[PDB]
Symmetry: D2
Subunit: 328 residues, 4 copies
Amino acid sequence: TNIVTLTRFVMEEGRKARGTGEMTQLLNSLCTAVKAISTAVRKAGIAHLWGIAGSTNVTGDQVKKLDVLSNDLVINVLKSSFATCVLVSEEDKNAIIVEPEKRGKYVVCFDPLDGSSNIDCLVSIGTIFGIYRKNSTDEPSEKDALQPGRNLVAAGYALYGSATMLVLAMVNGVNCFMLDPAIGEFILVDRDVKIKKKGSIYSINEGYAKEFDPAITEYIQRKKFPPDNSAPYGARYVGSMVADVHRTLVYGGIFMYPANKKSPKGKLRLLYECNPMAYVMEKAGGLATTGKEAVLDIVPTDIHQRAPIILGSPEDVTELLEIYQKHA
Amino acid sequence: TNIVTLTRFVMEEGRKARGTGEMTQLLNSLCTAVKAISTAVRKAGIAHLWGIAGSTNVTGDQVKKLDVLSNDLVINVLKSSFATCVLVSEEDKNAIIVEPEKRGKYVVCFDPLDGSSNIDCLVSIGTIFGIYRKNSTDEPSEKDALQPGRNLVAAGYALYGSATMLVLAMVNGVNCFMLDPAIGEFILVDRDVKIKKKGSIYSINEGYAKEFDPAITEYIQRKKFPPDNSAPYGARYVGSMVADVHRTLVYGGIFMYPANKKSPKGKLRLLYECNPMAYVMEKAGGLATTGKEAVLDIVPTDIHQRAPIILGSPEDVTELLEIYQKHA
Amino acid sequence: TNIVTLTRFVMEEGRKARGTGEMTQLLNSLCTAVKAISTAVRKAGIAHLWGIAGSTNVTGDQVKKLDVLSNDLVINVLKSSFATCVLVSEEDKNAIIVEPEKRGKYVVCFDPLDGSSNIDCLVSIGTIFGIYRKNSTDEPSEKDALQPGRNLVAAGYALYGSATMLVLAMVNGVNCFMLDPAIGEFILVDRDVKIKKKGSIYSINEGYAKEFDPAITEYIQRKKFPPDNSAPYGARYVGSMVADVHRTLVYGGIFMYPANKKSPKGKLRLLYECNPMAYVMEKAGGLATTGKEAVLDIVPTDIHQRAPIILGSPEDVTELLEIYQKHA
Amino acid sequence: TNIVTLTRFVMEEGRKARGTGEMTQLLNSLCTAVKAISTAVRKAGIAHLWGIAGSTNVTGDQVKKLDVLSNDLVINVLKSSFATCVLVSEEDKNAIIVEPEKRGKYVVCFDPLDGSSNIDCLVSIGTIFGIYRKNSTDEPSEKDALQPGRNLVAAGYALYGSATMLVLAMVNGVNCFMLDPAIGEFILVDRDVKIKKKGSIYSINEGYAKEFDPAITEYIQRKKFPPDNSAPYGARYVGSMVADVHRTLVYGGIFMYPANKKSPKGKLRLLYECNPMAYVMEKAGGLATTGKEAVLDIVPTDIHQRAPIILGSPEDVTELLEIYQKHA
Ligand SMILES: O=P(O)(O)OC[C@H]1O[C@](O)(CO)[C@@H](O)[C@@H]1O
Ligand SMILES: O=P(O)(O)OC[C@H]1O[C@](O)(CO)[C@@H](O)[C@@H]1O
Ligand SMILES: O=P(O)(O)OC[C@H]1O[C@](O)(CO)[C@@H](O)[C@@H]1O
Ligand SMILES: O=P(O)(O)OC[C@H]1O[C@](O)(CO)[C@@H](O)[C@@H]1O
Ligand SMILES: [Zn+2]
Ligand SMILES: [Zn+2]
Ligand SMILES: [Zn+2]
Ligand SMILES: [Zn+2]
Ligand SMILES: [Zn+2]
Ligand SMILES: [Zn+2]
Ligand SMILES: [Zn+2]
Ligand SMILES: [Zn+2]
Ligand SMILES: [Zn+2]
Ligand SMILES: [Zn+2]
Ligand SMILES: [Zn+2]
Ligand SMILES: [Zn+2]
């Protein structure tokens, strides 16, 4: 009878600061979009939402039907929030500038639907976002989305798994909210989340062993064959960045999508995939790197820019960095 | 307005045979239990269902809270179906014999909740079952559950992923039904499913490389480094047998949980995990083996017996068998 | 964890009899249709289901959109149940004969949607049904629907109120099941319901005072001005037969829709409105009359036949009959 | 994909004014409470929420279980909205003053659960509220709730009928939003509602005929026996102020709960029942009177004060006033 919704939670924090409150609006409208996607996904096969949309995004991805629905849902809700000015979506060629009448001081980068390969086999998928505060007075433009992750004021992701979860990270920390299907409210379930210092799980697509670099290769062998005769790490790779990362967060361990010989900048997109997760990861006492630099310190040059990403437990991520260092 | 529920579907088939119909009852009651688990899982964090139950099953697993709830749900519904006589659950030491008043001619083996390691990180989990028809007139006993998988008249699994799915395989084939949250009915979504002849995905926990046997080791290297200069298979390992298998079914490919140097009989349990999946896999044109024999031809000696299991696309599974043959 | 669904309940009873079980199928399929209507009604305004269908039924009613959807839903589910042979709907001119391949021994009369006037103002509405067992071997025809209510083997109604309820009456009694929105199962909530001997509520449309007959007129005055200086009955008239009747059942009292000077046979339809309610009412220790004969003893001559109906608490209904007797 | 939620709608209006926005917060938090009540009511029988709470409110009502749950839900959500300072509930003896830390400029009067007599028979029930803006700087107190209805800045009610509806009236008009069970969002369904000039339905409890006054008595006879030989009005009385009023709004007509010889001030409570409805009614082109004065012009003297109330279509309400005038 005393529901601790994400809305009550956020205001509860932003109360002290006493801002315009358009963030609470922003997140509220984001939650609405997140609930409709969750509901659409929960019945995609029956609703006939499986298949392709018949188009290709800048990243060359084959646009799916749930990419469109989720992209629209999110774009519309953000525009109607009267809290955003510039929007960047993986599904949109250029930055979406918000019409003057509904402009807000926030710039949001988002991956409408993450885990494309797992939509048809009911494997966990989600929505990733990053929120920057327009750091200028110039007329709103794509340039406002080209900020380093360190500039995020908030970020997180919606996880449509066996249960729908909204993980939200801000300046002071990370919190997980679970969508109560009954009343459609994200209830707090994990307060001030902290990833452990060291895990026992490594996740990466090992189908790319031939293209892996010396560092990645050694770290993996090290995971399978520990030098100190300790138990080898277990392995897990769902295939949806959102699902594996989230598991990293609550179970500890490491997630990797490094670059190979075919891709200098890895595969995941910096703006809407890496930075959000890097932000979340850091606000939970974790680390997120490319192998040679902190993902959040990268200054973008392209809204659809890619970047290698190694994240998770401090000690695990450091061990890999130490190896990249030895190989450099 | 002309809903094609699993119930209408099953009767639609069993109509010709004209049996007692206790199977339709069996599946109906199984669907009820499957909906409550799905609903409980959808709110496990908010409902406080996360954690351990404080006990250990015969397999040595650390019993979780959702194991108990789901175990009870399924046990009660099966007893009330007036269609079962002997029940085997991974969570029960011995076979549950159904009281005379509610006895039926069916023997059901089930894994109340599969994917234990993925419950707390919202990763796909499910329920696996196998249904045998009591092949005798002797007084019902555990012996009735010790039949080879080839004797299954039906089997399948409930998949609590981003959407709840019920995959059902019977003598004539496999069909997927999706749970419409609106009216709580499993609607047909994939009719007469057939796994493809060859996939491009291999799933197995590679954290056990040191314990892998020569055959497994070679197959994997072969997947990463193709001898014919073809593209390497992608990798995926969710961590819940139900999720990976189901993906194998609709995407094609191969799933493996072989034996190592520590486990002669692998890890998955024959009665409620392997046979069901082996049945499903075969009814879809696929294969399921231990590395040296068809999983369905194994005659059990213990209701909690383990067995190695390699399943999926015909050509992929054969290639591995050919290797096991070369190494023998 | 030990859900007492209507399905478990019905089998629980019909177990003793040991019939073909097509009744449990019948009710199961009826429950599916009842859940979709409930779900459609719950979002009729948002779904755009409000309005007219553009047609007139035999009774001259202006067919609504939810009449069609609900009519189809029910007709299809009954046909797919393999348990019915002749179907009578208020929305269908003639009796629907079930194609041989899906025929069953049951004849079902139903009011797809009751309370037409209350659909647009969100007032309680529902579905009424009566089930007769084909009492012959002749080729199925409309004649099989022209039986007296005393021949009902089961009957009841779905009530889409602030909660969706399914009231089911059979030879041994009445029971109320409530639709759990979570898992879409009608759970038992009121076992073996018995209406009280005398209520303190009278329900009837008093807008027809000018057309009321001497008996109705006197009974009403008597309700407002008690001869024994006792408290006057309270008044309640929702406007949907299903809602008022159901309230009569659990609160006691009396419901009336007598004939006037304009209608010799009242307004409600005998086959799908009066008999079901009369059956329910009697199985709960109540009474249902026309003012001069028991509604259940009327032998129909037309499937869309009307009949006056006074029902509810024994003593209240008797008092009115005594008045009709004095006026005759 | 472009959902028109109540939240988007309200901001859409309040945008021009450019206020603190605590109203949008107020309504948001009110919507959360409204969804949980709706969900609790939808399963009250199964949840065991039927019965009494074991207590009596100031009005002498026998407190029900859903009164408590709904009262708490609403009280907590309003306190957590950081938008209210003084709260008045029918279930609370005195005005609830909001602790300084969470104070807002709004005073809210509410009927946590309206239609007490119809909870157990699944008849439509709801939640009524009125929102006043603290018109002073004095320290918050009960005096702030003793304002005339004309001072309302907003008001409305939640209707838990066959569908859950939220009717919201503000300075510029009335709008109906329907709760989409799928995503838990109140979607706009009836924009700028206007009650018709004259209806053909009268609603009142005629069980109180003996206690009715000369005016009420004549109006009713006039409704049953039209002086101009026109068709008599139909009659409808659900028994829950919220349900009948709402029907008046969309169907036109008249609703009455006048005073009798036993009650000089009728029965409904001025603060949380009459004023809200009177406000709604007026903002829709309708009228709301006591029989001798506009309900909204009454200056309260007691937060649990009662007042007679006649509302609905202009011409119908005027006709009754003309009669009260002739009898005075
Ligand atoms: O199949 P691959 O190359 O391992 O890519 C998997 C990655 O693809 C993504 O869908 C990004 O496109 C991520 O969600 C996931 O981590
Ligand atoms: O962590 P591991 O050893 O790879 O085990 C994973 C397997 O465990 C199980 O939960 C069985 O206990 C399966 O669902 C899953 O495939
Ligand atoms: O408006 P009237 O004449 O009172 O009719 C009300 C009756 O109409 C019905 O809708 C039947 O058509 C019943 O549900 C209800 O009892
Ligand atoms: O039974 P009565 O005296 O007609 O009272 C009905 C009224 O009671 C209320 O519940 C108020 O207590 C209203 O919702 C309804 O209009
Ligand atoms: Zn993509
Ligand atoms: Zn995407
Ligand atoms: Zn992505
Ligand atoms: Zn286990
Ligand atoms: Zn298990
Ligand atoms: Zn398992
Ligand atoms: Zn009709
Ligand atoms: Zn009808
Ligand atoms: Zn009807
Ligand atoms: Zn009360
Ligand atoms: Zn109340
Ligand atoms: Zn009230």
